[PDB]
mmCIF file of C-alpha atoms and ligand atoms in Angstrom:
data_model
loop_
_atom_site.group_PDB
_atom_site.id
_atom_site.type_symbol
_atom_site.label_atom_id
_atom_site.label_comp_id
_atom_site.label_asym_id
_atom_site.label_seq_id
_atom_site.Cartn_x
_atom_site.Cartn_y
_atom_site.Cartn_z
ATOM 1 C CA UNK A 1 1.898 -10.162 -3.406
ATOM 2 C CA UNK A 2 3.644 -7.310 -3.590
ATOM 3 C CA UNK A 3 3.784 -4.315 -0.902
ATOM 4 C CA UNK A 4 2.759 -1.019 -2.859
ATOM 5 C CA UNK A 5 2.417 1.078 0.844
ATOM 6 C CA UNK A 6 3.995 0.713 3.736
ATOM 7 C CA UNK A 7 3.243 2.702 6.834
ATOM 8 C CA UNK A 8 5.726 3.270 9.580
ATOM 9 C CA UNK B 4 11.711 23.754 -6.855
ATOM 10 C CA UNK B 5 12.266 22.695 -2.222
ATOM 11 C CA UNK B 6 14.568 20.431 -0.301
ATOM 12 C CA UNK B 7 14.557 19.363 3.335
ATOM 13 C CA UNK B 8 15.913 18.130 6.019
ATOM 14 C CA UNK B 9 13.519 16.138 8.750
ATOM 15 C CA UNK B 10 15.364 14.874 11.785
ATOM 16 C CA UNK B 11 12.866 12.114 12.920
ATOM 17 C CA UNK B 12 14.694 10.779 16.409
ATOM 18 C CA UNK B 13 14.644 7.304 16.024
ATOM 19 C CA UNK B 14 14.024 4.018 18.633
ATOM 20 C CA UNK B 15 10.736 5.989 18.974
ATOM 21 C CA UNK B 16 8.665 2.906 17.167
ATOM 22 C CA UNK B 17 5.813 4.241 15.427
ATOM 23 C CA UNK B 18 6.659 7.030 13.266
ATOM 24 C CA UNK B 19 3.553 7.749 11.907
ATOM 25 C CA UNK B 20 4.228 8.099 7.813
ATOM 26 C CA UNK B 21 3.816 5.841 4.466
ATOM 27 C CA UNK B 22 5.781 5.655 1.951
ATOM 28 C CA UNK B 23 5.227 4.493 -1.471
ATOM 29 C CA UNK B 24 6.765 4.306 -4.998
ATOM 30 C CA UNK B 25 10.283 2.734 -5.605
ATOM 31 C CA UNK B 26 12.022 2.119 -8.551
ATOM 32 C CA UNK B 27 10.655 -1.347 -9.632
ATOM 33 C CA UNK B 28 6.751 -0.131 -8.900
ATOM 34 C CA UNK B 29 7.454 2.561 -11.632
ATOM 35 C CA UNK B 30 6.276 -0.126 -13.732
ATOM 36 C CA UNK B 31 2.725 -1.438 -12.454
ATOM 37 C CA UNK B 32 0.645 1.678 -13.577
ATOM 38 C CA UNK B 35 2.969 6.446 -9.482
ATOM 39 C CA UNK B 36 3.890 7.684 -12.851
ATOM 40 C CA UNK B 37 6.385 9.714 -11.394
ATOM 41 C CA UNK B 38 9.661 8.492 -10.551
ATOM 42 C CA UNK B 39 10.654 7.994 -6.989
ATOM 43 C CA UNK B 40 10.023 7.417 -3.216
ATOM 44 C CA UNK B 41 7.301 9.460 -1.781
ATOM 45 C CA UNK B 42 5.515 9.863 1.311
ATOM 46 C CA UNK B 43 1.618 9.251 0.931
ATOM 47 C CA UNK B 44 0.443 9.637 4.943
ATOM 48 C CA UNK B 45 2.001 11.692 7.772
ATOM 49 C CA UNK B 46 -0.151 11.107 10.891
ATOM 50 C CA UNK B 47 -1.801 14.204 12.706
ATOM 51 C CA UNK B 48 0.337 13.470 15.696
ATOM 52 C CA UNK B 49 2.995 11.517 13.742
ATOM 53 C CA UNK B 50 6.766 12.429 14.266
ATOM 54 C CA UNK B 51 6.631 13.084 10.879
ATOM 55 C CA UNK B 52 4.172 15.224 10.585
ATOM 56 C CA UNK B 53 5.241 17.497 13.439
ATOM 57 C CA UNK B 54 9.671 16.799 11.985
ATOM 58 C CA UNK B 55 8.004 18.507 8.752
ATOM 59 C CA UNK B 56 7.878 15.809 6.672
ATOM 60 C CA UNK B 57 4.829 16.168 4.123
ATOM 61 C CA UNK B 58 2.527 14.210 2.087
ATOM 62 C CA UNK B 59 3.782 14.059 -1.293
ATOM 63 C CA UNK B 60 7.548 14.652 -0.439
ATOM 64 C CA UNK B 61 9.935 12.327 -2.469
ATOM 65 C CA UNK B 62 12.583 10.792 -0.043
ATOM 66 C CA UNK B 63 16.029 11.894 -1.718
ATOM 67 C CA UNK B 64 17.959 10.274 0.868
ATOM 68 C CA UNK B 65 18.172 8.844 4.074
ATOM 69 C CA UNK B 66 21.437 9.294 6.901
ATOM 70 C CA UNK B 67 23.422 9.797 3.548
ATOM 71 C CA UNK B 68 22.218 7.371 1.106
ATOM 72 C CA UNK B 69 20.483 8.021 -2.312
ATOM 73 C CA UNK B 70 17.438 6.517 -1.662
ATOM 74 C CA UNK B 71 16.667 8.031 -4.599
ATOM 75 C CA UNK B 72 15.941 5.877 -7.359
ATOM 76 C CA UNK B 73 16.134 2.575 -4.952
ATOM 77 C CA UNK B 74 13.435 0.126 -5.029
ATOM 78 C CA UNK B 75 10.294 -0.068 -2.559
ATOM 79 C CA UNK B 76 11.862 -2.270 -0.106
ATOM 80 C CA UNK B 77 15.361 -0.688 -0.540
ATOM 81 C CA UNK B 78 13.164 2.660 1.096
ATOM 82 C CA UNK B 79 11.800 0.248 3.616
ATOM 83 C CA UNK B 80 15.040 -1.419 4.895
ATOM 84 C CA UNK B 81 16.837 2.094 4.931
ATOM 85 C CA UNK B 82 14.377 3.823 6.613
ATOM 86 C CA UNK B 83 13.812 0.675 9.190
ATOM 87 C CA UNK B 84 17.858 0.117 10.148
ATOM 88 C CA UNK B 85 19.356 3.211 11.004
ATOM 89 C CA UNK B 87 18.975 6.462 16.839
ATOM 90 C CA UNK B 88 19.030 9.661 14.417
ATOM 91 C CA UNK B 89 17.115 9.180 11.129
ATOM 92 C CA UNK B 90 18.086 11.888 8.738
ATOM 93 C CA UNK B 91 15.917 12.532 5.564
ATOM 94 C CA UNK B 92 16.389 14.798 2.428
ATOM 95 C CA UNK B 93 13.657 15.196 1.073
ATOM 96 C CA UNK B 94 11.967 16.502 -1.964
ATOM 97 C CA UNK B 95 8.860 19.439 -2.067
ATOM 98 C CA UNK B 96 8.463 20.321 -5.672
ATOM 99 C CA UNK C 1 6.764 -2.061 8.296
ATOM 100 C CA UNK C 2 2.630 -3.182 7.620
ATOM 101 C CA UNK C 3 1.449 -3.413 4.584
ATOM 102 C CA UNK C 4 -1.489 -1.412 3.656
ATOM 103 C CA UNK C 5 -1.342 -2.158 -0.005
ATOM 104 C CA UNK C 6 -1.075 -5.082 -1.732
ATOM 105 C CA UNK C 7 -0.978 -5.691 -5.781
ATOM 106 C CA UNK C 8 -1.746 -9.033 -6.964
ATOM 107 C CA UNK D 4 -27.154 -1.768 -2.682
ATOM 108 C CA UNK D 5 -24.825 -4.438 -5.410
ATOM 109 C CA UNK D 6 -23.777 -7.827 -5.082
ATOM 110 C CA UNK D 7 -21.780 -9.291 -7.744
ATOM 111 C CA UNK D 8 -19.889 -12.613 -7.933
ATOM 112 C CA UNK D 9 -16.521 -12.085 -10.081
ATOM 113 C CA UNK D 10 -14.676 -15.664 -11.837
ATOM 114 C CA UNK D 11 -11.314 -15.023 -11.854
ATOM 115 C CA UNK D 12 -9.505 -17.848 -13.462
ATOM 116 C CA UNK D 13 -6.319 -19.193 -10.716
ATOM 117 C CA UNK D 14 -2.939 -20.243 -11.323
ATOM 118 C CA UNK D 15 -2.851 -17.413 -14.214
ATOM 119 C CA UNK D 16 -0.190 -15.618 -12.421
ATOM 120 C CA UNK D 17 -0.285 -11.581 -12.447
ATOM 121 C CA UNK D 18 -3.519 -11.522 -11.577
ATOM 122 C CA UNK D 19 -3.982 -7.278 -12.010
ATOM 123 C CA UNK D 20 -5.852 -5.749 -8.834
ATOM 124 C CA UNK D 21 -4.939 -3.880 -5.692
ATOM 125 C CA UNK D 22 -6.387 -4.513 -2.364
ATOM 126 C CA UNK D 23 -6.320 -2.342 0.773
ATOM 127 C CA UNK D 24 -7.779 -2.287 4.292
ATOM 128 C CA UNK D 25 -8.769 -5.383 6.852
ATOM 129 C CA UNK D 26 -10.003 -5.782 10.267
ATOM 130 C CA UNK D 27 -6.983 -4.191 11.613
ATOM 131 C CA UNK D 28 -5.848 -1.446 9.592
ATOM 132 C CA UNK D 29 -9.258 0.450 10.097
ATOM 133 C CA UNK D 30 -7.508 1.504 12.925
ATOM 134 C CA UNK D 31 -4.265 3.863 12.300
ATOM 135 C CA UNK D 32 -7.096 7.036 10.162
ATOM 136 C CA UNK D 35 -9.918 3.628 5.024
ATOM 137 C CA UNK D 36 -12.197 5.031 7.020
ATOM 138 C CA UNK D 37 -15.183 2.571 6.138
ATOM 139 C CA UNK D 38 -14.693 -1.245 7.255
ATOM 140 C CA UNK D 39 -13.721 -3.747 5.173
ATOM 141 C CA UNK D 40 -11.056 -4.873 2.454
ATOM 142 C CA UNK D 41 -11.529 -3.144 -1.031
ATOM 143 C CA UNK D 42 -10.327 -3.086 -4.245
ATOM 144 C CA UNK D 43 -8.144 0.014 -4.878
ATOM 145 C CA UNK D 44 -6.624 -0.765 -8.776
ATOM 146 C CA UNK D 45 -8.125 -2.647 -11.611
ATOM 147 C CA UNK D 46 -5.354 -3.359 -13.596
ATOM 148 C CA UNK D 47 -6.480 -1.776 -17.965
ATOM 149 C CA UNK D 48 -5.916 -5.314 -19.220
ATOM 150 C CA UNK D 49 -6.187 -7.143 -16.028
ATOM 151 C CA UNK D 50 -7.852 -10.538 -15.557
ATOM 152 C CA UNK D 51 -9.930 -8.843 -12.538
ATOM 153 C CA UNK D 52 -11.110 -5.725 -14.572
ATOM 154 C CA UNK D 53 -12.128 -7.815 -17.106
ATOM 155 C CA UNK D 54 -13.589 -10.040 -15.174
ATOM 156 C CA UNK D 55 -15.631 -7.590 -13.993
ATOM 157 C CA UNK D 56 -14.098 -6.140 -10.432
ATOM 158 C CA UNK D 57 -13.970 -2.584 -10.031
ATOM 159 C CA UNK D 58 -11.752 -0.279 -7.827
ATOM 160 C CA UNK D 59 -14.017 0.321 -4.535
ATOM 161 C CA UNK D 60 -15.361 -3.200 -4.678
ATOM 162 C CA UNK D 61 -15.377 -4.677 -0.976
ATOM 163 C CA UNK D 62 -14.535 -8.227 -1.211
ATOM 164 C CA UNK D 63 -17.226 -10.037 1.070
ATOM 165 C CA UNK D 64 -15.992 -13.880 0.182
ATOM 166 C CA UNK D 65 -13.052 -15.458 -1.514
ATOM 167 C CA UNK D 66 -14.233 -19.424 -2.358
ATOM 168 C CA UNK D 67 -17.062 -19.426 0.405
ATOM 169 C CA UNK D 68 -14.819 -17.588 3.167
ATOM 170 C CA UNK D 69 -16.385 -14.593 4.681
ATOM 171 C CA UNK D 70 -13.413 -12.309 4.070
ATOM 172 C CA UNK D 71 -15.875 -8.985 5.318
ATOM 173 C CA UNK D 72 -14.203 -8.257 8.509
ATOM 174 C CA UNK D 73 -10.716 -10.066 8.245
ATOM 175 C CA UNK D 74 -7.222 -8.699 8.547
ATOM 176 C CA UNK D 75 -5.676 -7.212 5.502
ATOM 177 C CA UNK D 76 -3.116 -10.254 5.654
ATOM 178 C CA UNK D 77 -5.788 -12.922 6.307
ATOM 179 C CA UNK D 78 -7.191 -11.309 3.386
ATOM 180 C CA UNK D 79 -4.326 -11.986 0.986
ATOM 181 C CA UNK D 80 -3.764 -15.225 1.950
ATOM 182 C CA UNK D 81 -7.134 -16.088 1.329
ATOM 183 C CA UNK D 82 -6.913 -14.804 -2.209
ATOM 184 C CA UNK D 83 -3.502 -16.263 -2.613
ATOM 185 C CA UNK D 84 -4.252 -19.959 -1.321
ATOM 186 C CA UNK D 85 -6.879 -21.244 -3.715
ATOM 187 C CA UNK D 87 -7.356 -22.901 -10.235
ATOM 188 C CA UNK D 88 -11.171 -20.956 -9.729
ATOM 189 C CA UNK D 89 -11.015 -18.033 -7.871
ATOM 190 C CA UNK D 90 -14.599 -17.611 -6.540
ATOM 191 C CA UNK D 91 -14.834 -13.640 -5.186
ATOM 192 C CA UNK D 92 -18.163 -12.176 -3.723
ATOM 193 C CA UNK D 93 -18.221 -8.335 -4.063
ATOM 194 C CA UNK D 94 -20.396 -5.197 -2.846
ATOM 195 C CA UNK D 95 -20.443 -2.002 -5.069
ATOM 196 C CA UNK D 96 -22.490 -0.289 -2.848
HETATM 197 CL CL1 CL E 101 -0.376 6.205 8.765
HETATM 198 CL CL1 CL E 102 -1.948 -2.837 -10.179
#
């Protein structure tokens, strides 16, 4: 529950 | 020992990158410190601004996104027409 | 802004 | 061709694994389908319990999380005190 990538 | 600067135009939506690290996930075993970029896309503004996989994002229209938490990277990179990165390529 | 990891 | 069934104990808190993929992130290039297991935390309750990084998670309590969004999928593992997980280790 936590965001370990984040594609943009 | 690099540094860079990518000038990603921005209102473009997709940007076609990912970014990882931050300075609470230093914990969780990266075990280097810092903001990095994991994924440009072949055809990603990214990719083609320069930015590379593995560069750490130093900072971002003038902050120092360096040593800032995962979602402090997020929210910077997400608000700010003219996105301007300094990055890292050592 | 999706996340494409997730630690739990 | 492996099929395992992993017990993972609920309401325990940090539960120690990674997941990655879904339905609709085998889109922007995992290249395989499916969700999968990317970390096993040293001491965590999953890698203890026996799931390995590169498990696909077929089924979370009886749901057939094989071919589900990446968000579907952590809400599925999120939701439910026995955490019933069917994996392939193929
Ligand atoms: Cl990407
Ligand atoms: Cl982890």
């Amino acid at each position: 529950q936590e965001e370990w990538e984040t594609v943009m | 020992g690099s540094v860079e600067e990518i000038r990603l135009p921005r209102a473009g939506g997709p940007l076609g990158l990912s970014i990882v690290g931050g300075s609470d996930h230093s914990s969780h075993p990266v075990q280097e410190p810092g903001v990095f970029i994991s994924k440009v896309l072949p055809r990603g503004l990214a990719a083609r601004s320069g930015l590379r996989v593995g560069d750490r994002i130093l900072a971002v229209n003038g902050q120092d996104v360096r040593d800032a938490t995962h979602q402090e990277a997020v929210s910077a990179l997400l608000r700010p027409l003219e996105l301007s990165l300094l990055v890292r390529r050592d």
